[PDB]
Design a protein around this ligand. Structure first.
Ligand code: FAD
Length: 453
């Protein structure tokens, strides 16, 4: 176990009680460095290890599609942890008041949590640190290389972060040891009841069409840690060979579809890299997939970690902020509201079809996501309004929303983060421009539109 994967958030006196794992971002039993580190510390202290998940009050800022996917994965996760003699306690309320109360009530000795660069995660840490007296650690179980170890500053481009990540691969890209069960079973409600009351409070704000029927289709992605492995095996055996040539074709389902499992942490990205690296397929397709799940994925955590205002206009590069400021007073072709973008009532059938896929499946195609966000910038009153509309529609209907990948992706499409300066156009400026005629020459837009009516 590499000691570089774990950071110390707060020092203090260690108690004689069970080591608590505050699971937030990585909801899985296998390939969880934070869970493995908690077990190792528990073994050395001759005490059991426990897992504590907090059902925060911000679940109403999302939809049922993200609430059911996460909770139904925990129901399978609770059974798996119980088979390892590891109890799980699901708390409802503020993490600042629930974690600090659980530590005091159960005489916790050491508190461990997974790493997350999001602002909401840092808000909870500030509350938890102020109310605990036991050692506090955090472990990066999401990225293959720890976020603080890949780079010590903000990487403005992928070609500068790629050499730093690949050079650290021989040290951190390794196999996961078996999660040892607890020696004995140690000494706040049913998840089924939490899902029933949670959905009931989310029914009035459910996405529906004119016929009062739901828009979301839950049969596309089955939640759970077992289902994530089945999808990963399907991609390597069926879609990995043609991934490098059909990644930019929205009409073909040639993607891995691992993001909803990678977002909630139901499957480890390092596990996906290990299986792909030992798989024999097209070298140009493996390189394309490795560049997306390692470079572009972990650079999204580098963006949110080394930029506090990652969701603001100030995190954009200097060239993009000056170019957008020089085209603020340009007459936009169209100005749509948030309700018009949400309902897909624009003049672009390609953009509307992209939005419908977001509403129905909850996972828009990787290529169309770049087009869907750049048209928001072109059809908004200001770049600040484009950021809010893109972030809102992303975190609300994307099954992988509220993730550093989304914020880095939105900042790339609107502010050109991790991008270069292109030809200077009106309104958009030097930000990379994507046209409807450009997509027609790239893929069959007629089939993509006709699929999502
Ligand atoms: C405007 C916009 C919004 C986005 N919204 C989200 C979002 O809400 N949540 C989210 O997790 N990702 C988001 N992304 C990144 C990307 O679109 C998705 O991660 C990708 O579509 C995931 O689906 P997939 O696994 O089938 O694609 P794949 O090509 O099979 O990629 C597999 C994994 O590689 C990573 N990856 C691939 N492409 C990217 C990328 N462009 N940026 C970062 N990581 C990547 C992801 O971890 C992904 O799960 C967004 C990108 C843009 C441009």
């Amino acid at each position: 176990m590499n000691p570089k994967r774990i950071r110390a958030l707060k020092s203090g006196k260690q108690g004689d009680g069970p080591v608590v794992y505050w699971m937030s971002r990585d909801q899985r039993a296998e390939d969880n460095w934070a869970l493995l580190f908690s077990r190792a510390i528990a073994k050395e202290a001759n005490v059991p290890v426990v897992v504590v998940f907090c059902l925060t009050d911000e679940f109403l800022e999302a939809g049922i599609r993200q609430y059911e996917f996460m909770l139904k994965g925990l129901q399978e996760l609770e059974v798996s942890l119980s088979r390892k003699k590891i109890p799980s306690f699901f708390l409802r309320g503020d993490p600042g008041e629930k974690i600090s109360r659980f530590v005091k009530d159960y005489n916790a000795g050491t508190l461990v949590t997974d790493f997350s660069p999001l602002r909401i995660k840092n808000q909870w840490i500030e509350k938890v640190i102020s109310g605990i007296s036991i050692p506090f650690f955090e472990v990066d179980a999401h990225n293959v290389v720890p976020c603080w170890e890949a780079s010590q500053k903000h990487e403005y481009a992928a070609h500068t972060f790629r050499p730093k990540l690949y050079a650290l691969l021989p040290e951190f890209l390794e196999e996961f040891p078996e999660l040892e069960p607890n020696s004995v079973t140690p000494e706040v409600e049913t998840l089924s009841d939490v899902l029933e009351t949670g959905v009931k409070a989310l029914l009035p704000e459910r996405a529906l069409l004119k016929n009062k029927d739901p828009l979301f289709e839950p049969w596309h992605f089955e939640p759970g840690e077992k289902a994530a492995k089945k999808v990963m095996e399907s991609f390597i055996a069926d879609r990995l060979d043609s991934y490098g040539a059909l990644r930019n074709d929205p009409t073909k389902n040639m993607l891995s579809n691992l993001s909803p499992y990678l977002h909630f942490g139901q499957i480890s990205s390092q596990r996906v890299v290990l299986e792909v690296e030992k798989a024999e397929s097209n070298p140009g397709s493996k390189k394309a997939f490795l560049d997306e799940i390692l470079i572009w994925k972990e650079i999204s955590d580098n963006f949110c970690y080394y930029n506090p205002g990652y969701d603001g206009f100030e995190s954009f590069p200097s060239w993009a902020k000056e170019s957008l400021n020089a085209h603020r007073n340009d007459v936009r072709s169209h100005i749509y509201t948030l309700e018009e973008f949400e309902a897909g009532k624009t003049h672009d059938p390609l953009w509307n079809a992209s939005q419908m896929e977001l509403l129905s499946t909850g996972k828009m195609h990787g290529y169309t996501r770049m087009y869907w966000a750049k048209k928001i910038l072109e059809w908004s009153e200001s770049p600040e309004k484009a950021l809010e509309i893109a972030i809102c529609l992303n975190d609300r209907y994307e099954l992988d929303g509220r993730d550093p990948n989304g914020y880095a992706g939105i900042a790339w499409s609107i502010g050109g983060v991790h991008d270069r300066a292109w030809g200077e156009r009106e309104v958009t400026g030097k930000i990379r421009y994507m046209s409807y005629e450009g997509c027609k020459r790239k893929f069959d837009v007629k089939l993509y539109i006709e699929k999502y009516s």
